Amino acid sequence: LAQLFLQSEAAYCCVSELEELGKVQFRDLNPDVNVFQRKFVNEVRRCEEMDRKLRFVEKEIRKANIPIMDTGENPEVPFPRDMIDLEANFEKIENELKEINTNQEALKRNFLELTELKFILFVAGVINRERIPTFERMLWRVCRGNVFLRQAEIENPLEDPVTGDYVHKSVFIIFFQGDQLKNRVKKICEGFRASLYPCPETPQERKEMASGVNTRIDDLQMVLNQTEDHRQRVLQAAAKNIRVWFIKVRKMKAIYHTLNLCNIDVTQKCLIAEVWCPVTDLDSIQFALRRGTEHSGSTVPSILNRMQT
Amino acid sequence: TEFWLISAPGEKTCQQTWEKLHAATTKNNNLAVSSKFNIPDLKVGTLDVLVGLSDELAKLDAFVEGVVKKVAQYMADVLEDSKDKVQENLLASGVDLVTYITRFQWDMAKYPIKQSLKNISEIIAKGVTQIDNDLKSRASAYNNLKGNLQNLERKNAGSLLTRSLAEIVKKDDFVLDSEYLVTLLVVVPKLNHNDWIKQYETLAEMVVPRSSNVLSEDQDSYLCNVTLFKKAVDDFRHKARENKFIVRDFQYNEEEMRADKEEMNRLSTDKKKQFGPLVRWLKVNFSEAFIAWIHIKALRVFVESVLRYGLPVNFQAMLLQPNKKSVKKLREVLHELYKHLDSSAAQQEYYPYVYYKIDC
Amino acid sequence: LSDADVQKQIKHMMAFIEQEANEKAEEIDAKAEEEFNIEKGRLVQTQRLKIMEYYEKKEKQIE
Amino acid sequence: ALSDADVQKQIKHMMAFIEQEANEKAEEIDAKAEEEFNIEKGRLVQTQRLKIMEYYEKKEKQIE
Amino acid sequence: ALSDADVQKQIKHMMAFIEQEANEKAEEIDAKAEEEFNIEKGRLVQTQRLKIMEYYEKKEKQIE
Amino acid sequence: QSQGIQQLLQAEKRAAEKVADARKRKARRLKQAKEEAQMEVEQYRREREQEFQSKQQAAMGSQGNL
Amino acid sequence: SQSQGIQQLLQAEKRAAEKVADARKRKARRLKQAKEEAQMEVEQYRREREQEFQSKQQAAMGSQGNL
Amino acid sequence: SQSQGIQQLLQAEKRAAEKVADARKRKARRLKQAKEEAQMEVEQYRREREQEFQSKQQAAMGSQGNL
């Protein structure tokens, strides 16, 4: 149970060195002190947040089945304070990726609606047609036999915007002169599995409008495709960088955890820590300590005092 | 007696015979009663108005039906021309619905046939609303008199502990305007009746000899009066309590007892006096309400028939009085009769004809 | 449904539209005649009184 | 269940009791009558006597 | 692999470290004290020199 | 009932007589009190008047004499 | 048979449109006629008032001369 | 002997604490000295200005009585 005493910067480096060495068992110097009380909570919190963010991204990356081998570089384990900035850059990726997916879904929805419009423009309306026999009957119940029901069908329908599959679709569209029936069938169609939202138009002007939007949506789909390919390129590069950094971060957290398990000096901003180690290890550690302190710019002697307790 | 209100396209005049004459399609093989409605020739402006009318009439029909029930139940409480066991259906203009339907017409007296549907529906609605409010007022007045009367009857009812003394005590039982005596009333258990007659003498100082008597008797206890010195009132009551007698402090008051009896008789008289005309008025207004129920639903069926079939407006509408256990056959016959002529598009929702239940 | 029901639905679609059209036009012409008389009377009375006032003032001046 | 003597004595007592109360009240009334007599005489005689004195004093000043 | 002398030498080193910081910190404090000294003095000397200057100048103006 | 009634009627009569008689006496004594008071103050007035008259003749004499 | 029903109802709607436009046209025609007649009555009123004017003016001139 | 090293470091920290508080005390003393010297300087500045004034005044009297 020997006690070592040295500056917190030298301690940072030493913890790095001792943790990779793996032969030191540390004792907790402040059993009555909580993480808030240790004052490493800011560093751990930062670690936890970036950890969660990386995990979030990693989960999305895994969902996409990316090859990222996560081959090495992990053994270098540096822990600069600049990791906070690295974290933010990776945070930006998460935000970007989430934004893109959110936007992608939004664009996807718009695409499907415009896809319906393509079919809607004579005019083929869009229904799910699960039970149209009943839709028709309800329509006649509210008024039977008053107006012609026009039928249209969709050839080779594509994936249902909701169901996610390809089913045949056909629709009965009725023009009404009365407002009471428009409101009636609005409520009916809302209850029924159908998309009958726009007004039918015979005028050429609406056909031109539909042509316009049918082109625009195609352009938006091309943009979607481009943003998704970019996202995939970004995700592969991040996958490699993140897997390696992720492990490095886990080590960072490990270090800060260990650093919490200490006593903070009052005389100098130094920590004293106790380890239980055999002499063989103690000699190796002294050498390790020189290596550690040498990596730190302060090269603090970092005295370890043998104890017979 | 329940009736079904049904209307067919009426495209052919043969429909009446088809409906009524030809056993294959006649209601229950022409055993059930089926009478034609006489409906004036009214027009529907637009389809949108037709639909509005449809909903508004369904609402108004339920409203009036409820009112009819409310007024009928009121009279049932009155027990004037309707009871719970008999005379449940209201009469239309003083005759039964069966009679009324036999001679059914749309009534120009309730709404001119030259009125638009909006105006007609409004006039009837206003009529029924007014009828309901009139009922609310008269019923409140009757319920008020009924409760207050019973409360007064109850006040002078009951056992000797709580029953009003008004019908018990006489002016001739008390020494009135006495200089120094007070009269106490004691309710004595039957088992201690003779005991009281004697014991009361020794419950206080300064008691007048042989002044006691029995004022009234009951099955569980007797009510006796005693006259004694004013200051002994406290002692008598205490010793009376000790001997398990209940002693009431009752000061005879001729004016209060008479006033109470006059109020009881006055309210009884006023209640009967209002009742007579009350129930005569209500009976009349309820008949009118029932007829309105009939008119408004005949219109309902009119406009629904128009909405269901279009124009012209000559439909085959029959009032059916089902035969016992014939509802299966009736459905069968009406289904075959009209289903083959229209479409599969049209129970509670889809029926080959217009059909409303008359709950009578 | 068969073509017979289609044609019935159509007949109904025509029939209600025509009835509405006939009623509205009739309503329109009846009110038009009312407006004819109303506007006519208002105009006539409006200017007749002004003419009267002109005349009366001059008459007064004459006497 | 009572004899004539037992109740007769109690009736006699009730009546005498009432007479005794009336007698005591009458005595109280005469004592108060004497008090009111003296009160009224004193108040009146002094009030009038004062008026006489003031009268003559004023008359005395005029004469002298 | 250190003897009592070697651990004591490293302790002595750490103490020298502390003495070095003690000196640098004190020097930093005295340097700022010197800055405040000079700043306040210049302010004061110019303020009062000018006040008496302006008085005298005004009297001189009155003379001329 | 008739025994209690006769008894209370007799007690009422005597009590009423007792208090009415004392009330009458009070009224009588008060009137007597007023008459006696009046007679005394009237005698007092007469005597003061005689003194007054005596004094006025004497006052006039002295004034006449000066 | 769908195209026939479509055509037929459009024909009904067209006639309806013609019907209301023409009813409104008649309304307009009647209103102008109303204005023309109104003015005619006004002019009749004018002539009457002018004649009475002439009558009064000459009567006063004559009468006034005498007196 | 770690507890002795730690106490010796505590003593060193106590001395550091004293040395800085003492520096702050000197700072205060130096500031008061600065004010005292400032006033001494003001009195000398006034002296110089007074001497210049009187010199100028005598020159002015000569020049003014002249011409």
mmCIF file with all atom_site columns, all heavy atoms in Angstrom, chain B residues 9 11 13 16 27 30 51 56 71 86 92 110 123 126 141 156 159 172 185 199 203 222 230 249 261 266 273-274 338, unseen atoms left out:
data_model
loop_
_atom_site.group_PDB
_atom_site.id
_atom_site.type_symbol
_atom_site.label_atom_id
_atom_site.label_alt_id
_atom_site.label_comp_id
_atom_site.label_asym_id
_atom_site.label_entity_id
_atom_site.label_seq_id
_atom_site.pdbx_PDB_ins_code
_atom_site.Cartn_x
_atom_site.Cartn_y
_atom_site.Cartn_z
_atom_site.occupancy
_atom_site.B_iso_or_equiv
_atom_site.pdbx_formal_charge
_atom_site.auth_seq_id
_atom_site.auth_comp_id
_atom_site.auth_asym_id
_atom_site.auth_atom_id
_atom_site.pdbx_PDB_model_num
ATOM 1   N N  . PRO B 1 9   ? -90.672  2.738   -54.478 1.00 0.00 ? 9   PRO B N  1
ATOM 2   C CA . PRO B 1 9   ? -90.537  3.727   -55.553 1.00 0.00 ? 9   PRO B CA 1
ATOM 3   C C  . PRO B 1 9   ? -91.907  4.161   -56.023 1.00 0.00 ? 9   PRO B C  1
ATOM 4   O O  . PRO B 1 9   ? -92.102  5.332   -56.356 1.00 0.00 ? 9   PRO B O  1
ATOM 5   C CB . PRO B 1 9   ? -89.755  2.975   -56.633 1.00 0.00 ? 9   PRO B CB 1
ATOM 6   N N  . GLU B 1 11  ? -93.298  3.291   -58.825 1.00 0.00 ? 11  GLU B N  1
ATOM 7   C CA . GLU B 1 11  ? -93.256  3.636   -60.237 1.00 0.00 ? 11  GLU B CA 1
ATOM 8   C C  . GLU B 1 11  ? -94.535  3.221   -60.948 1.00 0.00 ? 11  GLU B C  1
ATOM 9   O O  . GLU B 1 11  ? -95.008  3.934   -61.836 1.00 0.00 ? 11  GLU B O  1
ATOM 10  C CB . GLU B 1 11  ? -92.040  2.980   -60.893 1.00 0.00 ? 11  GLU B CB 1
ATOM 11  N N  . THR B 1 13  ? -98.689  2.009   -60.949 1.00 0.00 ? 13  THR B N  1
ATOM 12  C CA . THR B 1 13  ? -99.834  2.085   -60.058 1.00 0.00 ? 13  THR B CA 1
ATOM 13  C C  . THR B 1 13  ? -100.154 0.706   -59.528 1.00 0.00 ? 13  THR B C  1
ATOM 14  O O  . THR B 1 13  ? -100.745 0.572   -58.444 1.00 0.00 ? 13  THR B O  1
ATOM 15  C CB . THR B 1 13  ? -101.053 2.645   -60.780 1.00 0.00 ? 13  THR B CB 1
ATOM 16  N N  . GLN B 1 16  ? -99.609  -0.511  -55.802 1.00 0.00 ? 16  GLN B N  1
ATOM 17  C CA . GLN B 1 16  ? -100.494 -0.546  -54.653 1.00 0.00 ? 16  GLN B CA 1
ATOM 18  C C  . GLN B 1 16  ? -101.023 -1.958  -54.521 1.00 0.00 ? 16  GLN B C  1
ATOM 19  O O  . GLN B 1 16  ? -100.915 -2.571  -53.451 1.00 0.00 ? 16  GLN B O  1
ATOM 20  C CB . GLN B 1 16  ? -101.627 0.465   -54.817 1.00 0.00 ? 16  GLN B CB 1
ATOM 21  N N  . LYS B 1 27  ? -98.042  -7.529  -48.038 1.00 0.00 ? 27  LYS B N  1
ATOM 22  C CA . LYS B 1 27  ? -97.443  -7.684  -46.720 1.00 0.00 ? 27  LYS B CA 1
ATOM 23  C C  . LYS B 1 27  ? -98.124  -8.828  -45.990 1.00 0.00 ? 27  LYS B C  1
ATOM 24  O O  . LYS B 1 27  ? -99.344  -8.805  -45.791 1.00 0.00 ? 27  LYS B O  1
ATOM 25  C CB . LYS B 1 27  ? -97.570  -6.385  -45.931 1.00 0.00 ? 27  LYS B CB 1
ATOM 26  N N  . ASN B 1 30  ? -101.175 -10.236 -47.615 1.00 0.00 ? 30  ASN B N  1
ATOM 27  C CA . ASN B 1 30  ? -102.350 -9.375  -47.507 1.00 0.00 ? 30  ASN B CA 1
ATOM 28  C C  . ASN B 1 30  ? -103.139 -9.625  -46.231 1.00 0.00 ? 30  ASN B C  1
ATOM 29  O O  . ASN B 1 30  ? -104.322 -9.281  -46.160 1.00 0.00 ? 30  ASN B O  1
ATOM 30  C CB . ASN B 1 30  ? -103.271 -9.506  -48.728 1.00 0.00 ? 30  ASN B CB 1
ATOM 31  N N  . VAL B 1 51  ? -80.661  16.752  -47.906 1.00 0.00 ? 51  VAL B N  1
ATOM 32  C CA . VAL B 1 51  ? -79.834  16.118  -46.878 1.00 0.00 ? 51  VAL B CA 1
ATOM 33  C C  . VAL B 1 51  ? -79.974  16.866  -45.563 1.00 0.00 ? 51  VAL B C  1
ATOM 34  O O  . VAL B 1 51  ? -80.092  16.256  -44.483 1.00 0.00 ? 51  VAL B O  1
ATOM 35  C CB . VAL B 1 51  ? -78.367  16.057  -47.337 1.00 0.00 ? 51  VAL B CB 1
ATOM 36  N N  . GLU B 1 56  ? -82.169  17.087  -40.051 1.00 0.00 ? 56  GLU B N  1
ATOM 37  C CA . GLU B 1 56  ? -82.879  17.970  -39.151 1.00 0.00 ? 56  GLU B CA 1
ATOM 38  C C  . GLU B 1 56  ? -84.157  17.286  -38.710 1.00 0.00 ? 56  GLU B C  1
ATOM 39  O O  . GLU B 1 56  ? -84.544  17.362  -37.541 1.00 0.00 ? 56  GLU B O  1
ATOM 40  C CB . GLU B 1 56  ? -83.173  19.301  -39.836 1.00 0.00 ? 56  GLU B CB 1
ATOM 41  N N  . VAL B 1 71  ? -95.016  13.685  -22.015 1.00 0.00 ? 71  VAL B N  1
ATOM 42  C CA . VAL B 1 71  ? -96.348  14.166  -21.688 1.00 0.00 ? 71  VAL B CA 1
ATOM 43  C C  . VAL B 1 71  ? -97.228  12.975  -21.376 1.00 0.00 ? 71  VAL B C  1
ATOM 44  O O  . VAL B 1 71  ? -98.098  13.035  -20.496 1.00 0.00 ? 71  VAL B O  1
ATOM 45  C CB . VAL B 1 71  ? -96.916  15.003  -22.846 1.00 0.00 ? 71  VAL B CB 1
ATOM 46  N N  . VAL B 1 86  ? -102.779 -0.014  -19.433 1.00 0.00 ? 86  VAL B N  1
ATOM 47  C CA . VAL B 1 86  ? -103.702 0.222   -20.533 1.00 0.00 ? 86  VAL B CA 1
ATOM 48  C C  . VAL B 1 86  ? -103.480 1.630   -21.068 1.00 0.00 ? 86  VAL B C  1
ATOM 49  O O  . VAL B 1 86  ? -102.935 2.496   -20.383 1.00 0.00 ? 86  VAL B O  1
ATOM 50  C CB . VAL B 1 86  ? -105.177 0.044   -20.116 1.00 0.00 ? 86  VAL B CB 1
ATOM 51  N N  . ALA B 1 92  ? -104.646 10.404  -31.380 1.00 0.00 ? 92  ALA B N  1
ATOM 52  C CA . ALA B 1 92  ? -104.448 11.497  -32.317 1.00 0.00 ? 92  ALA B CA 1
ATOM 53  C C  . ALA B 1 92  ? -105.789 12.180  -32.496 1.00 0.00 ? 92  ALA B C  1
ATOM 54  O O  . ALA B 1 92  ? -106.699 11.577  -33.080 1.00 0.00 ? 92  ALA B O  1
ATOM 55  C CB . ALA B 1 92  ? -103.900 10.987  -33.646 1.00 0.00 ? 92  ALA B CB 1
ATOM 56  N N  . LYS B 1 110 ? -101.296 22.414  -39.059 1.00 0.00 ? 110 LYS B N  1
ATOM 57  C CA . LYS B 1 110 ? -100.060 22.518  -38.317 1.00 0.00 ? 110 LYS B CA 1
ATOM 58  C C  . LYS B 1 110 ? -99.040  23.271  -39.126 1.00 0.00 ? 110 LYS B C  1
ATOM 59  O O  . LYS B 1 110 ? -98.231  24.011  -38.566 1.00 0.00 ? 110 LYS B O  1
ATOM 60  C CB . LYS B 1 110 ? -99.515  21.133  -37.962 1.00 0.00 ? 110 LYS B CB 1
ATOM 61  N N  . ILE B 1 123 ? -92.063  25.272  -38.320 1.00 0.00 ? 123 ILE B N  1
ATOM 62  C CA . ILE B 1 123 ? -93.335  25.504  -37.650 1.00 0.00 ? 123 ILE B CA 1
ATOM 63  C C  . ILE B 1 123 ? -93.634  24.333  -36.746 1.00 0.00 ? 123 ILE B C  1
ATOM 64  O O  . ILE B 1 123 ? -94.048  24.506  -35.591 1.00 0.00 ? 123 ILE B O  1
ATOM 65  C CB . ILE B 1 123 ? -94.460  25.717  -38.674 1.00 0.00 ? 123 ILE B CB 1
ATOM 66  N N  . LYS B 1 126 ? -91.330  24.445  -33.724 1.00 0.00 ? 126 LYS B N  1
ATOM 67  C CA . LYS B 1 126 ? -91.704  25.503  -32.804 1.00 0.00 ? 126 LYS B CA 1
ATOM 68  C C  . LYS B 1 126 ? -92.901  25.054  -32.003 1.00 0.00 ? 126 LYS B C  1
ATOM 69  O O  . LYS B 1 126 ? -92.975  25.270  -30.788 1.00 0.00 ? 126 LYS B O  1
ATOM 70  C CB . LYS B 1 126 ? -92.000  26.790  -33.571 1.00 0.00 ? 126 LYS B CB 1
ATOM 71  N N  . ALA B 1 141 ? -96.208  22.833  -11.717 1.00 0.00 ? 141 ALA B N  1
ATOM 72  C CA . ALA B 1 141 ? -97.285  23.282  -10.846 1.00 0.00 ? 141 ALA B CA 1
ATOM 73  C C  . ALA B 1 141 ? -97.980  22.091  -10.203 1.00 0.00 ? 141 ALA B C  1
ATOM 74  O O  . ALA B 1 141 ? -98.244  22.086  -8.991  1.00 0.00 ? 141 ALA B O  1
ATOM 75  C CB . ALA B 1 141 ? -98.283  24.121  -11.639 1.00 0.00 ? 141 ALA B CB 1
ATOM 76  N N  . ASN B 1 156 ? -99.843  15.529  9.691   1.00 0.00 ? 156 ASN B N  1
ATOM 77  C CA . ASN B 1 156 ? -100.858 15.204  10.680  1.00 0.00 ? 156 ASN B CA 1
ATOM 78  C C  . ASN B 1 156 ? -101.079 13.703  10.769  1.00 0.00 ? 156 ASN B C  1
ATOM 79  O O  . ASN B 1 156 ? -102.060 13.256  11.371  1.00 0.00 ? 156 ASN B O  1
ATOM 80  C CB . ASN B 1 156 ? -102.170 15.912  10.347  1.00 0.00 ? 156 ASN B CB 1
ATOM 81  N N  . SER B 1 159 ? -97.465  8.255   14.347  1.00 0.00 ? 159 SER B N  1
ATOM 82  C CA . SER B 1 159 ? -97.639  7.775   15.703  1.00 0.00 ? 159 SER B CA 1
ATOM 83  C C  . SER B 1 159 ? -97.669  8.965   16.653  1.00 0.00 ? 159 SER B C  1
ATOM 84  O O  . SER B 1 159 ? -97.388  10.103  16.275  1.00 0.00 ? 159 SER B O  1
ATOM 85  C CB . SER B 1 159 ? -96.525  6.803   16.083  1.00 0.00 ? 159 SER B CB 1
ATOM 86  N N  . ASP B 1 172 ? -111.368 21.868  24.281  1.00 0.00 ? 172 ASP B N  1
ATOM 87  C CA . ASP B 1 172 ? -112.089 21.442  25.464  1.00 0.00 ? 172 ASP B CA 1
ATOM 88  C C  . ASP B 1 172 ? -111.233 20.595  26.391  1.00 0.00 ? 172 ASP B C  1
ATOM 89  O O  . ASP B 1 172 ? -111.728 20.162  27.433  1.00 0.00 ? 172 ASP B O  1
ATOM 90  C CB . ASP B 1 172 ? -113.345 20.666  25.057  1.00 0.00 ? 172 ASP B CB 1
ATOM 91  N N  . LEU B 1 185 ? -98.072  17.606  28.071  1.00 0.00 ? 185 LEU B N  1
ATOM 92  C CA . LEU B 1 185 ? -98.616  16.406  27.460  1.00 0.00 ? 185 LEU B CA 1
ATOM 93  C C  . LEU B 1 185 ? -97.647  15.253  27.637  1.00 0.00 ? 185 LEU B C  1
ATOM 94  O O  . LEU B 1 185 ? -96.445  15.438  27.480  1.00 0.00 ? 185 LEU B O  1
ATOM 95  C CB . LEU B 1 185 ? -98.896  16.628  25.973  1.00 0.00 ? 185 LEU B CB 1
ATOM 96  N N  . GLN B 1 199 ? -99.012  7.476   38.744  1.00 0.00 ? 199 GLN B N  1
ATOM 97  C CA . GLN B 1 199 ? -97.669  7.892   39.122  1.00 0.00 ? 199 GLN B CA 1
ATOM 98  C C  . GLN B 1 199 ? -97.534  9.384   38.939  1.00 0.00 ? 199 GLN B C  1
ATOM 99  O O  . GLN B 1 199 ? -96.793  10.035  39.686  1.00 0.00 ? 199 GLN B O  1
ATOM 100 C CB . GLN B 1 199 ? -96.618  7.150   38.298  1.00 0.00 ? 199 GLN B CB 1
ATOM 101 N N  . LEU B 1 203 ? -94.985  12.972  40.668  1.00 0.00 ? 203 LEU B N  1
ATOM 102 C CA . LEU B 1 203 ? -93.835  13.445  39.917  1.00 0.00 ? 203 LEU B CA 1
ATOM 103 C C  . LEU B 1 203 ? -93.493  14.894  40.225  1.00 0.00 ? 203 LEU B C  1
ATOM 104 O O  . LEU B 1 203 ? -92.380  15.327  39.917  1.00 0.00 ? 203 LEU B O  1
ATOM 105 C CB . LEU B 1 203 ? -94.082  13.279  38.416  1.00 0.00 ? 203 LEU B CB 1
ATOM 106 N N  . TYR B 1 222 ? -100.373 5.887   25.128  1.00 0.00 ? 222 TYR B N  1
ATOM 107 C CA . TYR B 1 222 ? -101.525 6.765   25.277  1.00 0.00 ? 222 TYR B CA 1
ATOM 108 C C  . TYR B 1 222 ? -101.035 8.200   25.424  1.00 0.00 ? 222 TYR B C  1
ATOM 109 O O  . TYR B 1 222 ? -99.943  8.442   25.946  1.00 0.00 ? 222 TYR B O  1
ATOM 110 C CB . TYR B 1 222 ? -102.381 6.368   26.482  1.00 0.00 ? 222 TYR B CB 1
ATOM 111 N N  . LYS B 1 230 ? -96.833  26.233  37.061  1.00 0.00 ? 230 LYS B N  1
ATOM 112 C CA . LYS B 1 230 ? -95.847  26.567  36.039  1.00 0.00 ? 230 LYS B CA 1
ATOM 113 C C  . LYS B 1 230 ? -94.449  26.129  36.459  1.00 0.00 ? 230 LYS B C  1
ATOM 114 O O  . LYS B 1 230 ? -93.733  25.470  35.696  1.00 0.00 ? 230 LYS B O  1
ATOM 115 C CB . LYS B 1 230 ? -95.879  28.070  35.751  1.00 0.00 ? 230 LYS B CB 1
ATOM 116 N N  . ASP B 1 249 ? -94.067  19.333  25.146  1.00 0.00 ? 249 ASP B N  1
ATOM 117 C CA . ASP B 1 249 ? -94.495  20.668  25.536  1.00 0.00 ? 249 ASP B CA 1
ATOM 118 C C  . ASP B 1 249 ? -95.350  21.244  24.418  1.00 0.00 ? 249 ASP B C  1
ATOM 119 O O  . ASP B 1 249 ? -94.824  21.775  23.436  1.00 0.00 ? 249 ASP B O  1
ATOM 120 C CB . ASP B 1 249 ? -93.291  21.557  25.825  1.00 0.00 ? 249 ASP B CB 1
ATOM 121 N N  . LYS B 1 261 ? -105.239 23.635  9.282   1.00 0.00 ? 261 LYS B N  1
ATOM 122 C CA . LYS B 1 261 ? -106.290 22.858  8.641   1.00 0.00 ? 261 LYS B CA 1
ATOM 123 C C  . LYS B 1 261 ? -106.806 23.585  7.412   1.00 0.00 ? 261 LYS B C  1
ATOM 124 O O  . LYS B 1 261 ? -107.082 22.954  6.378   1.00 0.00 ? 261 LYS B O  1
ATOM 125 C CB . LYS B 1 261 ? -107.423 22.595  9.631   1.00 0.00 ? 261 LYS B CB 1
ATOM 126 N N  . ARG B 1 266 ? -107.154 24.045  1.622   1.00 0.00 ? 266 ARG B N  1
ATOM 127 C CA . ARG B 1 266 ? -107.052 24.962  0.502   1.00 0.00 ? 266 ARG B CA 1
ATOM 128 C C  . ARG B 1 266 ? -106.174 24.328  -0.555  1.00 0.00 ? 266 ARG B C  1
ATOM 129 O O  . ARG B 1 266 ? -106.496 24.368  -1.748  1.00 0.00 ? 266 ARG B O  1
ATOM 130 C CB . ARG B 1 266 ? -106.484 26.303  0.960   1.00 0.00 ? 266 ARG B CB 1
ATOM 131 N N  . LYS B 1 273 ? -108.694 21.309  -8.317  1.00 0.00 ? 273 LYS B N  1
ATOM 132 C CA . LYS B 1 273 ? -109.238 22.293  -9.246  1.00 0.00 ? 273 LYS B CA 1
ATOM 133 C C  . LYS B 1 273 ? -108.307 22.470  -10.432 1.00 0.00 ? 273 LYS B C  1
ATOM 134 O O  . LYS B 1 273 ? -108.755 22.572  -11.579 1.00 0.00 ? 273 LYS B O  1
ATOM 135 C CB . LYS B 1 273 ? -109.459 23.627  -8.534  1.00 0.00 ? 273 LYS B CB 1
ATOM 136 N N  . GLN B 1 274 ? -107.006 22.532  -10.167 1.00 0.00 ? 274 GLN B N  1
ATOM 137 C CA . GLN B 1 274 ? -106.065 22.645  -11.260 1.00 0.00 ? 274 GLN B CA 1
ATOM 138 C C  . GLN B 1 274 ? -106.021 21.336  -12.026 1.00 0.00 ? 274 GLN B C  1
ATOM 139 O O  . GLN B 1 274 ? -106.020 21.340  -13.260 1.00 0.00 ? 274 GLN B O  1
ATOM 140 C CB . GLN B 1 274 ? -104.680 23.019  -10.734 1.00 0.00 ? 274 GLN B CB 1
ATOM 141 N N  . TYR B 1 338 ? -89.159  -5.374  -53.225 1.00 0.00 ? 338 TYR B N  1
ATOM 142 C CA . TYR B 1 338 ? -88.423  -4.211  -53.718 1.00 0.00 ? 338 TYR B CA 1
ATOM 143 C C  . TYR B 1 338 ? -86.960  -4.439  -54.067 1.00 0.00 ? 338 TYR B C  1
ATOM 144 O O  . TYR B 1 338 ? -86.433  -3.711  -54.912 1.00 0.00 ? 338 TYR B O  1
ATOM 145 C CB . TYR B 1 338 ? -88.497  -3.076  -52.688 1.00 0.00 ? 338 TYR B CB 1
#
